[PDB]
């Protein structure tokens, strides 16, 4: 299967925040506050988008950035909630 | 020497206007708290330094640095950026 990398930023109303967050945790890695990322197949990306589309209503927003692969660096300014691992 | 960046901020309302105004000088506001655009490394280092002197107290700015603009964006829900006529 052809594979992509995605970065998802959502902006949804507070009544819907738990349904969007639980749905995104099934497919993707929780980075921080409202940002999810990870590898997805194309059937899985279309399934996530369809299930997101049935949740979002009424000026809710989900940004899905679709990449051919994981060729990036991430730098965090401020609080990094992601735990630090020991690399020898 | 040149990169594409995607910036997502999570800042308290006391400092939010200062983070938004600074990111608007360097980058394009996509929508809600996401900025993106091209930057040189001198500009990315300067933006990050000025961001570091603003954030306090569990404020967070995610800066994703890419070698170029090789991606698509799909939006679910409200698209704030207007759609243009391409003929």
Domains of chain B and any CATH numbers:
1-67 (3.30.70.240)
Tokens 């006391």 locate to B14
Report d(CA B2, CA B81) in Å as an integer: 25
Report d(CA A22, CA B6) in Å as an integer: 24
Contacts of A85 (CB under 8 A, 6+ apart): none
Evaluate whether A63 touches B73 at the Cβ level (below 8 Å): yes
Closest CA to B14 of B43, B57, B76: B57
Overall resolution, Å? 2.8
Closest CA to A16 of A46, A66, A51, A40: A51
Cβ separation of B60 and A71 shorter than 8 Å? no
B24 half-sphere exposure, CB direction, 13 A CA radius: 9
Report d(CA B61, CA B55) in Å as an integer: 8
Report d(CA A6, CA A44) in Å as an integer: 11
**Burial (0-12, 13-18, 19+ Cβ within 10 Å), A59:** exposed
> What are A's interface residues with B at a Cβ cutoff of 8 A?
7, 9, 11-12, 31-35, 49, 52-53, 56, 59-68, 71-81
Structure-derived torsion over alpha carbons of residues A78, A83, A86, A87, reported in degrees to the nearest 10: -70
B-chain residues near A31 (CB < 8 A): 62
In degrees and rounded to multiples of 5, residue A84 shows phi and psi of: -95, 130
Report d(CA A53, CA A31) in Å as an integer: 22
B30 half-sphere exposure, CB direction, 13 A CA radius: 23
Report d(CA A24, CA A28) in Å as an integer: 6
Give bridge partners of residue A77 from the DSSP assignment: B61
Q: How was this structure determined?
A: X-ray
């Amino acid at each position: 299967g052809s594979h992509m990398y995605v970065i998802v930023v959502y902006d949804v109303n507070v009544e819907r925040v738990n349904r969007v967050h639980k749905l995104l945790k099934t497919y993707l890695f929780w980075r921080q506050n409202s940002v999810f990322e990870g590898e997805l197949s194309k059937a899985q990306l279309y399934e996530l988008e369809m299930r997101l589309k049935r949740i979002v209503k009424e000026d809710d927003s989900v940004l899905i950035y679709i990449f051919p692969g994981k060729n990036f660096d991430l730098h965090v300014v401020g609080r990094d909630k992601s735990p630090v691992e020991m690399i020898i």
